Amino acid sequence: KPEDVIKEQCARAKVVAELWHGFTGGAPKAALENLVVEFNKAQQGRCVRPVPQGGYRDLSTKIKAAFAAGKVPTMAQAFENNIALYLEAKALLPIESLGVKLQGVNLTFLNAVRFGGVVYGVPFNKSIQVLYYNKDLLKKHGVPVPATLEEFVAAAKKLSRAEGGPVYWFQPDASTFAYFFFNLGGSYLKDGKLVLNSKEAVEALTLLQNGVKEGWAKPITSGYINQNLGSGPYAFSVDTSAGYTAYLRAAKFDLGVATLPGRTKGQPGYGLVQGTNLVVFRQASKEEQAVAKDFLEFVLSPRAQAVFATATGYVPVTEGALKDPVYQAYAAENPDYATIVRQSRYAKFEPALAEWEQIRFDILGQAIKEAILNKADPKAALDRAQKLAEDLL
Numbered sequence: 001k002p003e004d005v006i007k008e009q010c011a012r013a014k015v016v017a018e019l020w021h022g023f024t025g026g027a028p029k030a031a032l033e034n035l036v037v038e039f040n041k042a043q044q045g046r047c048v049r050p051v052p053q054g055g056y057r058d059l060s061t062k063i064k065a066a067f068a069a070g071k072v073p074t075m076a077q078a079f080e081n082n083i084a085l086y087l088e089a090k091a092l093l094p095i096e097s098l099g100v101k102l103q104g105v106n107l108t109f110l111n112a113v114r115f116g117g118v119v120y121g122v123p124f125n126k127s128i129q130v131l132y133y134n135k136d137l138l139k140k141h142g143v144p145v146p147a148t149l150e151e152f153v154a155a156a157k158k159l160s161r162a163e164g165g166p167v168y169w170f171q172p173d174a175s176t177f178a179y180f181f182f183n184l185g186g187s188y189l190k191d192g193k194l195v196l197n198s199k200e201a202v203e204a205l206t207l208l209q210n211g212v213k214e215g216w217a218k219p220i221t222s223g224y225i226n227q228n229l230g231s232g233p234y235a236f237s238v239d240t241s242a243g244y245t246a247y248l249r250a251a252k253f254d255l256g257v258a259t260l261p262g263r264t265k266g267q268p269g270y271g272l273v274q275g276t277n278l279v280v281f282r283q284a285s286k287e288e289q290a291v292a293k294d295f296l297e298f299v300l301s302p303r304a305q306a307v308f309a310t311a312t313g314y315v316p317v318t319e320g321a322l323k324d325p326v327y328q329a330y331a332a333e334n335p336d337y338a339t340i341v342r343q344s345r346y347a348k349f350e351p352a353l354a355e356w357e358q359i360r361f362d363i364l365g366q367a368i369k370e371a372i373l374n375k376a377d378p379k380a381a382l383d384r385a386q387k388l389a390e391d392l393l
């Protein structure tokens, strides 16, 4: 494989810097390991070991264990909220103390990893939500790509009527809620305080539940949306750009990628930023830190960013990445790459509080499933969510 190549690289190494990640397979995993092999080849017995830990939630659970055992890897993927938690432990090294150079890096991703003036993460695999669509099925019924939230709902109801089933496919999770929430004018923080049960949150959870009843919105409860394609007519999903190639290779129809429907034609909708930043832990040996520095400079390089971004659909984190010829060759051939970049300009983050991982999954994500799947009243599922959260915070 690639993992076999790396283990052999790491066996004849003097210094190994462990990189713990939440890639379970497909392109994120291949493209991460192909990049590590190139780095390991270019070094003289200095080496990065990538250790898959399962997914992002398994990943944060394994870093929590590591803090109890007091044995941290050199490097890990981390969200903004994961970084918050590891900083409460003062467990992370400031990235510019390594003199890792950060100019070029898009403010969007860079602002998100700076805490009290100080950067503690390197943006590595950053995604934006886009509107995936079935170009064949819009073209057939003469339905334009919808620009605004109102045209998106019209278009959904029209194509579901025409084709005999619900055409807007989604996962009833916090990530999909955030697209409708953010675009009905919603905000997580009000005067310093977390709110999950605001008028915009009920509006967004009520829009999704209305969609299910009305036969235009399809909950996917088993696998990614792209893994369910070919069961019933599909027109639309709002899904991470990091699935881009997995939709490409799954879809038996002509795939489209558009910017998100917004409130008005004046401006695309906001997408949620997902994916992770690379952090380096203080308990790593100076030798291990030296490898971390070099690895981080590699992954920020235009070529390695070009090859990552093009293999997956993640957003290139630098200016220099868009001016690389491998990127410019992929994009001159496939306009969905410039769509994903154009969508990266209209980008919102979940709140970066340490406890937000727990909250997004077991509380706000449980309130979304109770409404969509068990017909709980939207306001009553988010009133519960907000109390459980307030009791945790």
Ligand SMILES: Nc1nc2c(ncn2[C@@H]2O[C@H](COP(=O)(O)O[C@H]3[C@@H](O)[C@H](n4ccc(=O)[nH]c4=O)O[C@@H]3CO)[C@H]3CC(O)(O)C[C@H]32)c(=O)[nH]1
Pocket (backbone or CB within 6 Å): 022, 023, 024, 026, 028, 055, 056, 057, 060, 079, 081, 082, 125, 126, 127, 128, 175, 224, 226, 227, 239, 240, 241, 242, 243, 244, 246, 247, 274, 275, 276, 356, 357, 360
């Ligand atoms: N732990 C933790 N997780 C978080 C947080 N915020 C968001 N999420 C999770 O981030 C994923 C989005 O991040 P992204 O890197 O953009 O995308 C993932 C995969 O989703 C995507 N993928 C893979 C296969 C496929 O067929 N389709 C496809 O889209 O590939 C990438 C690597 O696996 C969501 C997905 C989830 O893990 O299932 C639950 C959500 C947080 O704060 N903490």
